[PDB]
Design a protein around this nucleic acid. Structure first.
Ligand SMILES: [Ca+2]
Ligand SMILES: [Ca+2]
Ligand SMILES: [Ca+2]
Ligand SMILES: [Cl-]
Ligand SMILES: [Cl-]
Ligand SMILES: [Mg+2]
Ligand SMILES: [Mg+2]
Ligand SMILES: [Mg+2]
Ligand SMILES: [Mg+2]
Ligand SMILES: [Mg+2]
Ligand SMILES: [Mg+2]
Ligand SMILES: [Mg+2]
Ligand SMILES: [Mg+2]
Ligand SMILES: [Mg+2]
Ligand SMILES: [Mg+2]
Ligand SMILES: [Mg+2]
Ligand SMILES: [Mg+2]
Ligand SMILES: [Mg+2]
Ligand SMILES: [Mg+2]
Ligand SMILES: [Mg+2]
Ligand SMILES: [Mg+2]
Ligand SMILES: [Mg+2]
Ligand code: NA
Length: 121
RNA sequence: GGCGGUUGCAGGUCUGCACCGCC
């Protein structure tokens, strides 16, 4: 973190609860230039503090670990995790549910086969 | 009706519907 990036992070940081954040919303909320916020969160993600599931949409890393354990729970009730079941269980729209699931697919946590996300590890 | 929107909801996925913007 530069000095400008450290001042906007102390701003952005308390706002990271259980919900994901778009860069642009973080920026509107803390009175910071959108692009300046974009670079600060990218460095926050290089540190290992927050993870972008899609470009500019971030969760705290411990939130990700909880989602990974929800996939383990559903895998064991159903035999696998599909979009519809995950978004039912999360209580969120299907679009965020698929963003999260496709995140895990591309880190190799799960693999997609048809509608299912199968535990890979 | 056309073109759009890091909008929402759905269905595996780039479309439908809704809402907004410009015509
Ligand atoms: Ca894990
Ligand atoms: Ca299933
Ligand atoms: Ca499995
Ligand atoms: Cl959430
Ligand atoms: Cl990623
Ligand atoms: Mg939502
Ligand atoms: Mg629903
Ligand atoms: Mg909603
Ligand atoms: Mg999606
Ligand atoms: Mg497939
Ligand atoms: Mg019309
Ligand atoms: Mg459009
Ligand atoms: Mg937005
Ligand atoms: Mg767009
Ligand atoms: Mg949309
Ligand atoms: Mg919009
Ligand atoms: Mg379909
Ligand atoms: Mg496809
Ligand atoms: Mg397309
Ligand atoms: Mg429509
Ligand atoms: Mg109307
Ligand atoms: Mg109107
Ligand atoms: Na939990």
């Amino acid at each position: 973190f530069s000095e400008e990036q450290q001042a906007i992070w102390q701003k952005a940081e308390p706002l990271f609860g259980d919900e994901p954040w778009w860069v642009r919303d973080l920026a509107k909320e803390t009175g910071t230039d959108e692009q300046a916020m974009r670079l600060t969160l990218r460095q926050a993600a290089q540190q290992g503090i927050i993870t972008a599931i899609v470009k500019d949409r971030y969760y705290r890393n411990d939130r990700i670990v909880e989602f990974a354990n929800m996939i383990r729970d559903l895998d064991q009730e159903c035999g696998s995790t599909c979009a519809a079941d995950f978004r039912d269980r999360l209580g969120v729209g299907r679009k965020l549910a698929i963003q999260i699931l496709e995140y895990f697919d591309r880190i190799g946590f799960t693999r997609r086969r048809g509608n299912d996300h199968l535990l890979r590890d």
